[PDB]
Every structure is written in structure tokens, then in C-alpha cells.
Amino acid sequence: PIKLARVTKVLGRTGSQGQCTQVRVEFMDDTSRSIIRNVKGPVREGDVLTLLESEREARRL
Amino acid sequence: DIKLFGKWSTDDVQINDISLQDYIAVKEKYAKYLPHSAGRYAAKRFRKAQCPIVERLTNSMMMHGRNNGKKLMTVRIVKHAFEIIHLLTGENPLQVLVNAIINSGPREDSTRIGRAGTVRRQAVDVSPLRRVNQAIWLLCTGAREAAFRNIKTIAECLADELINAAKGSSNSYAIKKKDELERVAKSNR
Amino acid sequence: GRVRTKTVKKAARVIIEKYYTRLGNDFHTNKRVCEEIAIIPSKKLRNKIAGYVTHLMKRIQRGPVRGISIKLQEEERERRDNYVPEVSALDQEIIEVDPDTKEMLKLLDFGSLSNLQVTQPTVGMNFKTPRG
RNA sequence: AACGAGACUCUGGCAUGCUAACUAGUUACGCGACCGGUCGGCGUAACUUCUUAGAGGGACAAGUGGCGUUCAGCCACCCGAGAUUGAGCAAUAACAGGUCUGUGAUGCCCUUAGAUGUCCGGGGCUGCACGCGCGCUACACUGACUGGCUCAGCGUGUCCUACGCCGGCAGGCGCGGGUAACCCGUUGAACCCCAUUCGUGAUGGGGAUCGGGGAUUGCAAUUAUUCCCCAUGAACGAGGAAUUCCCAGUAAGUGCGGGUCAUAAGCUUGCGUUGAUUAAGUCCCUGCCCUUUGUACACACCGCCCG
RNA sequence: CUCCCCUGUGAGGAACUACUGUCUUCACGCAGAAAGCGUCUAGCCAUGGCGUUAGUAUGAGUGUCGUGCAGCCUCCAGGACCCCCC
RNA sequence: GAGUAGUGUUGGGUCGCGAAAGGCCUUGUGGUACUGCCUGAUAGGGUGCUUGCGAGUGCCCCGGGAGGUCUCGUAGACCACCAUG
Ligand SMILES: [Mg+2]
Numbered sequence: 001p002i003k004l005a006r007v008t009k010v011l012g013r014t015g016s017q018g019q020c021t022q023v024r025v026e027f028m029d030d031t032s033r034s035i036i037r038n039v040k041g042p043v044r045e046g047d048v049l050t051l052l053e054s055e056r057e058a059r060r061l
Numbered sequence: 062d063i064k065l066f067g068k069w070s071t072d073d074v075q076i077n078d079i080s081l082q083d084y085i086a087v088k089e090k091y092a093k094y095l096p097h098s099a100g101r102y103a104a105k106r107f108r109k110a111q112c113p114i115v116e117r118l119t120n121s122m123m124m125h126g127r128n129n130g131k132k133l134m135t136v137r138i139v140k141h142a143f144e145i146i147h148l149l150t151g152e153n154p155l156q157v158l159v160n161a162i163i164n165s166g167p168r169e170d171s172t173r174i175g176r177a178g179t180v181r182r183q184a185v186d187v188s189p190l191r192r193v194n195q196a197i198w199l200l201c202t203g204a205r206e207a208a209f210r211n212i213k214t215i216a217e218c219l220a221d222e223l224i225n226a227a228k229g230s231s232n233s234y235a236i237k238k239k240d241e242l243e244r245v246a247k248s249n250r
Numbered sequence: 251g252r253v254r255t256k257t258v259k260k261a262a263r264v265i266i267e268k269y270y271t272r273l274g275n276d277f278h279t280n281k282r283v284c285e286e287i288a289i290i291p292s293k294k295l296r297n298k299i300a301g302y303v304t305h306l307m308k309r310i311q312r313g314p315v316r317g318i319s320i321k322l323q324e325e326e327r328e329r330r331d332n333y334v335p336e337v338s339a340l341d342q343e344i345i346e347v348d349p350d351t352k353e354m355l356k357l358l359d360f361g362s363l364s365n366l367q368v369t370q371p372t373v374g375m376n377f378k379t380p381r382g
Numbered sequence: 383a384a385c386g387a388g389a390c391u392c393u394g395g396c397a398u399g400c401u402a403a404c405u406a407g408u409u410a411c412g413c414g415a416c417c418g419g420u421c422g423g424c425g426u427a428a429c430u431u432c433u434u435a436g437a438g439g440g441a442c443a444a445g446u447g448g449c450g451u452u453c454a455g456c457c458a459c460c461c462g463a464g465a466u467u468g469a470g471c472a473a474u475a476a477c478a479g480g481u482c483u484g485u486g487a488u489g490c491c492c493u494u495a496g497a498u499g500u501c502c503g504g505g506g507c508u509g510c511a512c513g514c515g516c517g518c519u520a521c522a523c524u525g526a527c528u529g530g531c532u533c534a535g536c537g538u539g540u541c542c543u544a545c546g547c548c549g550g551c552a553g554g555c556g557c558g559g560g561u562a563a564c565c566c567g568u569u570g571a572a573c574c575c576c577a578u579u580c581g582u583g584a585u586g587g588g589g590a591u592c593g594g595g596g597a598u599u600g601c602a603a604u605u606a607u608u609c610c611c612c613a614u615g616a617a618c619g620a621g622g623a624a625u626u627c628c629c630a631g632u633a634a635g636u637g638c639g640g641g642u643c644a645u646a647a648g649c650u651u652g653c654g655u656u657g658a659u660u661a662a663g664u665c666c667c668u669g670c671c672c673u674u675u676g677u678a679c680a681c682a683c684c685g686c687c688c689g
Numbered sequence: 690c691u692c693c694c695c696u697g698u699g700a701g702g703a704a705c706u707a708c709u710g711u712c713u714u715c716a717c718g719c720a721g722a723a724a725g726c727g728u729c730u731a732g733c734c735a736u737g738g739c740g741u742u743a744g745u746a747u748g749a750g751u752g753u754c755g756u757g758c759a760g761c762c763u764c765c766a767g768g769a770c771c772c773c774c775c
Numbered sequence: 776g777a778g779u780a781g782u783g784u785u786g787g788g789u790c791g792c793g794a795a796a797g798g799c800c801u802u803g804u805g806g807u808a809c810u811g812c813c814u815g816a817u818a819g820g821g822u823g824c825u826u827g828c829g830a831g832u833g834c835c836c837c838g839g840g841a842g843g844u845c846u847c848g849u850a851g852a853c854c855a856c857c858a859u860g
């Protein structure tokens with residue numbers, strides 16, 4: 001299933017070369033579920049991310 | 062009233078996604094007459110989030126060496142490309158830019174992890190601005206590679222690649238590289 | 251990154267400390283105050299120092315500043331500090347006390363005090379933190 | 383508290399407020415022209431917006447709102463010309479860095495009248511089976527050509543060069559101005575902009591290598607100094623392992639000035655013009671810095687030292 | 690345990706020719722894959738690039754023939770609904 | 776009736792837990808909290824769910840009633856080359 005996500009906070013930048021941003025995800029379905037997630041490119045708080053695999057969790061690079 | 066290239070209408074177009082609604086421009090205000098505003102959008106972070114999308118497609122079309130400094134080559138080429146598009150599909154050519162941006166942009170992408178020389182990639186997910194940017198990149202590069210020597214006008218070949226990027230066909234070089242990114246994303250997960 | 255030199259902050263400290271009455275919360279006000287009060291070369295020095303005199307005043311009206319001592323804000327903090335509620339917090343009709351405290355008072359012949367109330371001793375003994 | 387960082391000097395951005403300009407223009411009025419205007423066309427009063435350049439103002443994280451031991455300071459917004467202008471100068475120390483070849487700046491050595499001196503005439507630094515390096519130019523359709531339309535700035539000049547006339551083109555002749563905001567010079571530079579011809583092939587893309595001729599410079603050009611006309615028209619199909627430079631009037635394209643210069647910029651040093659993609663983050667790599675730590679080293683790991 | 694709002698392709702009609710848009714068949718050029726097989730590179734090693742499979746297997750579109758697919762009416766279904774469960 | 780009957784145990788005890796039949800002799804308390812499950816009391820001992828975590832909040836039985844994606848915060852990040860000067 002395809003899902004949507006909301007940015008609650010920006011925590012740090014994960015990467016070897018300092019590539020990924022490690023961001024915190026609310027679900028736009030009004031659910032309270034909170035998952036950390038890796039995102040590439042620029043991110044500011046409040047943005048919406050589209051997840052193709054929505055059950056996956058964030059690991060440290 | 063504000064009419065793009067004198068014959069178009071910006072305010073009637075539509076955005077179907079929430080992520081790309083906050084970034085993609087030329088809906089409410091930003092709609093201009095001509096692409097070249099010579100403004101500074103690289104001044105501060107995300108200040109280039111707000112510049113006109115047509116200008117955004119415009120800026121990226123100078124991207125190879127001899128064409129580099131010449132901007133007007135583009136506001137020429139983007140001029141004839143739109144006027145071509147309206148003849149084929151028959152819709153507001155600025156709907157075709159929206160759909161090509163929305164569809165061509167990656168969703169998930171791979172970040173290289175390992176030691177140099179050994180590529181082992183892990184799947185992460187694209188940020189909205191990054192989606193827009195990569196998408197447009199893909200559009201301009203697809204147009205170049207497709208138009209190098211087929212003796213096609215870049216007007217003709219970009220209208221081609223844009224309409225095809227909008228429909229979702231594998232004709233577009235864009236949709237191709239996207240589909241590869243998402244598939245590698247699948248490989249890893 | 252915009253950060254003030256030792257010169258800037260030291261100067262604005264002494265300027266404020268001497269002239270505290272003449273400065274005001276406006277920038278150009280104290281800018282022209284410092285074109286007079288002190289002697290500074292150039293401009294970008296002047297402007298910065300004054301900016302800090304100002305900033306430091308906006309922190310002064312909040313309360314005591316670590317760097318400066320003025321008798322005027324010593325006096326305003328003599329007003330602010332001095333306070334008292336209509337009755338003392340040390341006045342209660344009933345003050346509760348442990349049997350032993352009552353004993354210690356009984357040594358001093360105060361076992362006759364009226365306001366006292368003897369409260370029940372706590373039966374378990376655990377005052378200690380479970381080591382580990 | 384002191385030096386280093388900053389401050390500072392030099393450059394760019396602001397000023398319809400000031401000081402003014404016949405060696406810069408403006409507005410106004412005349413004459414001039416061709417159909418009320420258009421004109422770098424000609425002259426007088428009007429003044430500083432333009433054009434210069436002096437004085438001094440202006441920005442100080444300032445104002446508001448967020449993150450902060452509400453502390454530094456960090457983010458967003460407004461008010462604004464400007465919320466990051468680009469260079470110079472550079473401590474305590476050192477390198478056994480480059481410099482007898484920039485010095486009438488030298489300590490030694492050698493040379494000293496068939497001179498390692500100097501001047502004269504030629505040759506040589508330029509040579510060619512090969513490696514390694516900056517840099518130019520291209521691989522074409524966002525392109526080549528052909529006509530047409532309107533743009534810069536820094537500087538250079540007793541040599542820059544106005545206008546004629548002869549010259550297909552390079553060039554000759556001549557007659558003129560300027561030690562320069564006066565004369566070259568309204569510096570009509572290149573892309574770009576508008577029409578035209580070309581049609582995916584070693585093609586008009588690319589032009590090396592050559593064979594003839596004209597003209598310049600110079601005593602002197604053969605070992606083509608350069609420039610110019612015809613021909614000759616070859617490699618080259620976006621470049622393997624590796625790697626270099628770069629964050630905003632910036633990368634890059636594009637011409638232009640100064641240096642070298644009798645004649646010369648594929649170099650340098652500056653100058654404008656057209657003008658972006660992406661990041662506002664991290665120590666992975668590379669590089670140096672601190673801190674802790676071990677040391678039998680201190681001429682300091684190119685150390686010390688055991689048979 | 691339902692009922693009834695919108696989606697489907699299961700059956701009947703008009704229409705089907707005229708209307709428009711999509712799947713059939715032929716000429717057309719354009720992108721264009723892999724199982725694998727080899728090679729090169731990460732000190733050793735493909736989970737990568739590049740060669741060969743092949744410009745195959747394919748897919749997006751323009752013009753030919755369809756007597757198609759349809760759009761307009763019904764249900765048979767499927768999902769939003771409810772309930773219910775919490 | 777009777778803390779008897781019955782029932783129950785580590786060492787004992789003057790025991791712990793705790794009935795009913797039936798009568799008699801005339802009322803035969805109020806106020807006020809809570810309450811997941813297990814064991815053995817609203818005590819003692821284990822053990823939980825609500826949002827990954829930390830807070831809150833709720834979780835005995837019945838009837839009826841309506842109102843519903845409980846609220847606030849939030850790092851929760853973990854997958855051997857090499858002598859000498
Ligand atoms: Mg490192």
C-alpha cells in the first residue's frame with residue numbers, strides 16, 4: 001500500500017558522507033503512530049513524505 | 062490578467078498530491094509573463110522553493126557546455142515546446158508540466174554504503190524538493206539524449222518527452238531512470 | 251558568524267556602567283550617546299558597541315546583569331525584592347510536629363505551647379536508597 | 383591584560399539631501415531637416431536626477447516572533463539600498479625550502495691577454511622512434527554558414543589614430559587631433575536577438591599537414607617571425623584506470639584592456655557581458671590541528687638498541 | 690448480523706451505420722528488458738559497471754480493415770457504509 | 776446457634792479459615808471512598824494491557840444513555856601489508 005507521512009522533527013544527519021537526513025514521521029491518517037525514517041535531499045519540518053513501504057523503520061548508516 | 066507567453070492561463074491548472082502542492086509553483090501568485098526574472102533564489106535555503114516552475118524547467122535546459130551561459134536559447138525553446146504540446150494533447154500545457162514533474166520524480170532512492178569501489182546501496186525515501194529537482198533534471202536530460210542527433214528540434218523532442226512523462230509511458234528517458242531507482246530501492250529495502 | 255569582539259562587549263559594559271542614566275532603549279539614541287560619551291575611531295566599531303549597550307539594556311530591565319553594577323538598578327532591585335504578604339507564612343493556627351520534637355521542647359519547658367499538633371510517627375523504617 | 387583572529391586600508395552596492403563642473407551631461411528655447419514627433423545636428427540661458435567625487439550619513443542581529451542553563455548566540459519574518467562585497471596587511475617560532483642567474487648586495491674557490499673578459503660574424507636554446515605535465519580547439523540541430531538589428535568596461539597613447547583617395551584582401555598614400563572625462567571614442571567588441579541556406583554521411587562539423595602567390599616588420603625572415611588569397615583538406619563519433627577547480631553576478635560561455643612588444647598572444651594580468659544546476663551538511667576519504675594516553679627517544683623514530 | 694450509496698463485465702436491450710474516444714489487422718519509425726553466459730573492478734568477493742544473448746522478448750503511438758469496445762437503461766456482484774466489536 | 780460443626784499446616788500452641796439446621800425477642804447502624812487479571816481478604820506476593828518508548832487515563836457486575844480514529848510529550852538510533860638510516 002502507498003501511504004503519506006508528516007514531519008514532526010528533524011534530529012540529525014545520517015550518512016558516511018553526510019548524505020541522509022534522519023527525520024521523525026507522524027502518519028497523516030490521523031493515527032498517532034510515530035516512526036523514525038531516512039530521507040534524501042533537503043527537509044524542513046511540516047513536509048509530507050510518500051512511503052511505498054510504510055512499515056519499514058530507520059537504521060543508522 | 063496574467064497570461065503565460067501571452068496566450069496561456071495559469072490559474073486553471075491543478076495539483077493532485079499534497080507533497081508537491083507546497084513546492085511546485087505558478088498557481089496562485091507566482092505566475093508571470095516571462096520565465097526570466099533574473100532573481101536570486103539560491104540566496105537562502107529553500108528560497109528556490111518559491112520560484113516559478115516554468116523558470117525552473119527553463120534554468121535546467123542550459124545544462125550542457127556550449128549552451129551554458131545562453132539563457133535565452135531556453136525561453137525560445139520552452140516557448141515553442143508549449144505551443145507544440147497544446148496541439149497534441151489539447152490541454153493546458155502547464156498541466157503537462159505538473160503531471161511530468163509528479164510522475165518523473167523518484168519516490169524511493171538508494172544511498173551508497175560501503176567502502177569505495179564496492180557499491181552496496183540502502184533504500185531511503187525522497188524529500189519533496191528533491192523530488193521536484195531530480196524530476197526536472199530527468200526531464201532536461203531525457204530531452205537532450207533523445208534530441209542529440211535524431212535531427213529533432215528540442216521543442217519537438219521536449220514536448221515529446223514531457224507528454225510521455227505525463228502519460229506514464231516508458232518512452233520518456235525520465236520515467237525510465239525513475240523506474241530503475243524505485244526497482245533498486247526494491248532490491249535492497 | 252556574527253559575534254562581538256572583546257572590545258565590543260567590554261566597552262559597552264563600562265559605557266553602560268558609568269552612563270546608565272543617559273542611555274535609552276533606542277538604537278540611534280545611544281549611538282549618538284556614544285559618539286559623545288566615549289571616543290571611538292571609525293564607524294563599524296561605534297555602531298557595534300552601541301548596539302551592545304542597547305542589547306544589554308533590554309537585558310537589564312529584565313533583571314540583574316552579570317557584568318555591570320549600577321546603584322540605580324540596585325535601588326530598583328531594592329524595590330522589586332522588598333515585598334511581604336499581608337500575613338506571614340510563619341503563622342499557622344496548627345503546626346504539626348513529631349512526638350520527639352515535642353520531647354525536645356519539653357526539655358526547654360515549651361511543652362505548654364497551644365498551636366502544636368502531635369502527628370502520628372511513621373511505622374515503617376525505610377529512609378534508605380536500595381543500593382545496586 | 384598583550385600580540386595573532388577581528389578592528390584597519392583598498393574595491394563594489396545606497397544618497398531625486400549637500401558641495402559643484404565649458405574638459406561631463408541635463409532640461410528649456412531658438413535655428414536645421416524629413417515626413418506634432420524623429421535626429422550625436424549646431425548654438426545658448428537651466429540645473430545636477432544622469433556623468434564624475436568629495437564631505438558626511440547608513441547596519442548595529444537592528445525591529446518583531448520562535449530555539450536557547452532565555453547566556454552567548456542560532457532560525458524565520460518585516461522595516462530597508464545592504465541582514466553572506468571581494469582583496470591587502472599577517473604572532474611566538476622554525477625549514478639546514480627557492481635565490482651566486484635581479485642587485486656597484488657578498489664570505490670563499492677559480493679564471494685572469496692563444497682570458498671563464500668583452501665585442502664582431504655565423505650557428506645553437508626550436509632539433510625527434512619516446513614517456514609525463516598546464517593550455518588551446520573541436521567533435522555539430524541549444525549547431526555551421528549568409529545577411530540584417532542593437533550592447534560593454536578596464537585601461538593603454540609623441541605612439542594611439544579622425545576623414546578622404548587608390549587598393550578584391552593584407553595594405554599604401556596621404557592630409558588632421560591628442561601629454562589626454564579635451565583627440566582615437568556616444569569607445570556601434572563577442573555571443574545573444576531576427577530572417578536565410580544547410581539536412582545525420584568524415585557532411586558545409588573539424589580543420590592539422592602542405593604547394594603555390596601578394597603585403598608588412600626589420601641590418602638581417604631560409605630553420606615557414608607574422609599577416610593575407612586560393613587550393614590541400616588529415617586525426618577527432620563526448621574520451622579507459624585515475625583526478626583537478628568550484629556555493630551566487632558565483633560556475634560557464636563569450637569577447638575586450640594591461641604585461642612581454644621593432645613586428646607578436648594558443649600565455650599571464652585585469653575587464654565587462656549572457657548567466658545556471660546543487661548544497662547551507664558530514665568526517666568516509668585526504669590533510670593538518672587540539673585533548674587523553676604509552677615511551678628505555680631529547681642531535682627527539684632518519685631516535686634508540688639486542689645477539 | 691445486515692442494507693444501499695457508489696465502483697465491476699456476469700447476463701438482457703436501445704444504440705450499434707451517423708456520434709466521439711479505446712482494443713483488432715498491415716506499412717511506419719523511436720525509445721528497449723532480462724534468466725544467463727563471459728569479462729573487468731572493489732587487497733581476496735558481485736550484491737555492481739561493461740561485453741554477448743539482440744537491437745530479440747517487448748510498449749507507447751499514426752493511418753488502413755473491424756460490423757468490434759463502448760458510452761445510454763435494468764439487475765447479478767463488488768467495494769464505501771453501517772451496524773457490531775471495542 | 777458458636778468463631779462450635781465441618782474444613783485447613785513448617786516448629787509447636789491457649790490455633791487459622793469459617794457453616795447450617797433451627798428457633799428466640801421485637802427493627803435488626805450511618806457517613807464516605809475503590810474495583811485489570813493470578814494467588815490467599817479492598818490486606819500480603821506475582822504479573823499486565825492503553826502509542827514504539829515515558830507520562831497521564833481507564834480497565835468488578837447490570838441497565839439505560841450517547842460520543843469516538845484518548846491526551847500530552849519523545850532518538851526509539853546497535854548488524855593482518857611494511858626491514859634499515
Ligand atoms: Mg578523517
Ligand SMILES: [Mg+2]
Pocket residue numbers: 680
Ligand atoms: Mg636521553
